[PDB]
Amino acid sequence: PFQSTLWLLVGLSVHVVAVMLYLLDRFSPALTLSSAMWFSWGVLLNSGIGEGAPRSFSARILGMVWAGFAMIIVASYTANLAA
């Protein structure tokens, strides 16, 4: 259901959005960089690896909708095979 160009673009999205967490974890007015990679990877893959609950509103406000990004992308997937 996907093309070659799709994977290499959604794949690079997780890391470019993961790094935004760390920048928002070292200027708070309790997340390490390694754990941030796990939390970003986990939600899309729907797997309970470690614990990646972040702190501060700004670092969290991205986490509000980041999980929702997993919804639409996966949702369209089942739509294709039906179609």
């Binding site: 959005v17 935004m20 928002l24 200027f27 007015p29 501060s56 509103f57 700004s58 406000i61 991205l62 509000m64 909708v65």
Partner: peptide, 19 residues
């Protein structure tokens, strides 16, 4: 759009917390 609005919130929280 959300990540663009994310930065403003952090700045507003940081600036308000400064004073």
């Amino acid at each position: 759009a959300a990540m663009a609005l994310s930065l403003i919130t952090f700045i507003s929280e940081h600036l308000f917390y400064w004073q």
